Design a protein around this nucleic acid. Sequence first.
RNA 1: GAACCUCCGCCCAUUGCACUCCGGGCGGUGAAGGAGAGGCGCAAGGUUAACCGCCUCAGGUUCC
Length: 101
Amino acid sequence: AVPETRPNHTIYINNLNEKIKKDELKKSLHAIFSRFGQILDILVSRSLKMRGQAFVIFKEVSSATNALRSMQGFPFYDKPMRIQYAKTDSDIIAKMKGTFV
RNA sequence: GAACCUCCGCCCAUUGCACUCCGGGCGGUGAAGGAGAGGCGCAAGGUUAACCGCCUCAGGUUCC
Ligand SMILES: *NC(=O)c1ccc(-c2c3ccc(=[N+](C)C)cc-3oc3cc(N(C)C)ccc23)c(C(=O)[O-])c1
Ligand SMILES: *O[C@H]1[C@@H](O)[C@H](n2cnc3c(=O)[nH]c(N)nc32)O[C@@H]1COP(=O)(O)OP(=O)(O)O
Ligand SMILES: *Nc1ccc([N+](=O)[O-])cc1[N+](=O)[O-]
Ligand SMILES: [Mg+2]
Ligand SMILES: [Mg+2]
């Protein structure tokens, strides 16, 4: 019904500072999120449609859940992070589960 | 082995759920001057312009 609240390998963060550059944003996200588990990948775009947002993809769903709870609202580049679970599996995960396309 | 990046900014608009990239406008620096190198296009065309795209490579960084 509301998939953004059902745990997922991938967390969706928005309300990020759009001023920060793509690579710096990716590496700072990794720095703050890697202690919660192994990170398959972190996807950021500076597109009009995708700026201010990032998908952080964990190997273990339990890792996503701990990262979200612990970093909900956390100040990051002067804006409180807003964290959800991704509404659908990231492609790399769909490939693992055998569900891709 | 993989991913991301590789000239420096300003303003306007945007709170947006992607996984092939992709809003608009304006400046500056550098003559060891198209932005790490090569190739190939494309651009440019003299007091000081062009500043881009693709592919390969290199490096930096984060990982496996
Ligand atoms: N090394 C070369 O083969 C070479 C380097 C630089 C120059 C050159 C210019 C070349 C082309 C230009 N336009 C097409 C407008 C302008 C150039 O401007 C300069 C300016 C200066 N200054 C000392 C101010 C030096 C060299 C320039 C060339 C060239 O053929 O002129 C070749
Ligand atoms: O193709 C490289 C890869 O197969 C293996 N290698 C090197 N470093 C690696 C790593 O950090 N992770 C993984 N998974 N695999 C790695 O070695 C091959 C060659 O790499 P080198 O840069 O060492 O090449 P060299 O010519 O020096 O032997
Ligand atoms: N190297 C060089 C310096 C300056 C100029 N110039 O025209 O001013 C030209 C060259 N060149 O190589 O032709
Ligand atoms: Mg260039
Ligand atoms: Mg470049």
